[model samples]
Target chain A: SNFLIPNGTFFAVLIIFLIVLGVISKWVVPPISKVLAEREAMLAKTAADNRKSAEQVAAAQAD
Target chain B: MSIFIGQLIGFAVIAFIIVKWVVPPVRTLMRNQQEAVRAALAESAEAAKKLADADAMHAKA
Candidate 1:
């Protein structure tokens, strides 16, 4: 009941907190993470595409 | 002692619910996430490999 002691309701709060945290992580954050992941994937593809063309030009000039 | 027992009961009940209801859905999401993310990882690896190969070719020339 002092500074170091927690009220009994603290466990209730922890339970509620865990449930919300888990629910949000399961349903909400996946979309955000996947969206960012796809963004990176597209960026990688663009890098590969641009590099391919650059190499082709170099080959044509050096030959 | 009721408060202490209440805390224990509350924790156990929540723990069971988490293991029973919550974990399955989240685990399912994790599995789906990995499969979904595999595409991005593959594409990224391919890009890095190509870059490495091109760099080598240029350095040799």
Candidate 2:
């Protein structure tokens, strides 16, 4: 059908799609990654500190 | 068709966004999660080893 073939509406839709993609990529994704990385770093540090404390306790009990 | 040009441009833009914005953050999240899990596992292993050492020392006393 003529409606099925590409036309002005198809171009318009493609432009809109590009605009939305650009906005999401520019604004939406970065902050989420920052938060995830920060949380991971904090968790790792806490785990390390806990391990250190546990070792100290064991050493003290042994002595 | 002439509209294929627009389609190509749209596809390129979408691909760029996915490669630049979507992929990096997902990769970082995965890497961070992996590192965190590995650290926690190592920490627990160290704690277990220390506990065992303490038990051995106590038994000898």
* Highest TM-score against the true fold, candidate: 2
Q: List the residue pairs that clash in candidate 1.
A: none
Per-residue CA lDDT of model 2 for B1-61, tens digit only, reads: 6699999999999999999999999999999989977877676667566656655665665
Residues B1-61 of candidate 1 have per-residue lDDT tens digits of: 9999999999999999999999999999999989877876676677767666766776666
Q: Alpha-carbon error at B6 in model 2, in Å? A: 1.9
Q: Candidate 2's error at A47, in angstroms?
A: 9.7
DockQ scores for all predicted structures: 0.08, 0.05
Off by over 4 Å in 1: A1-38, A41-63, B46-61
- The alpha-carbon deviation from the true structure for residue A43 of candidate 2, after best TM-score superposition, in angstroms, is 12
lDDT of 1 by residue, A25-44 (tens): 99889988998888876876
Candidate 2 lDDT score relative to the true structure: 0.77
Q: lDDT (CA) for every model shown?
A: 0.81, 0.77
Minimum summed lDDT over a 10-residue window in model 1 chain A is located at A48-57
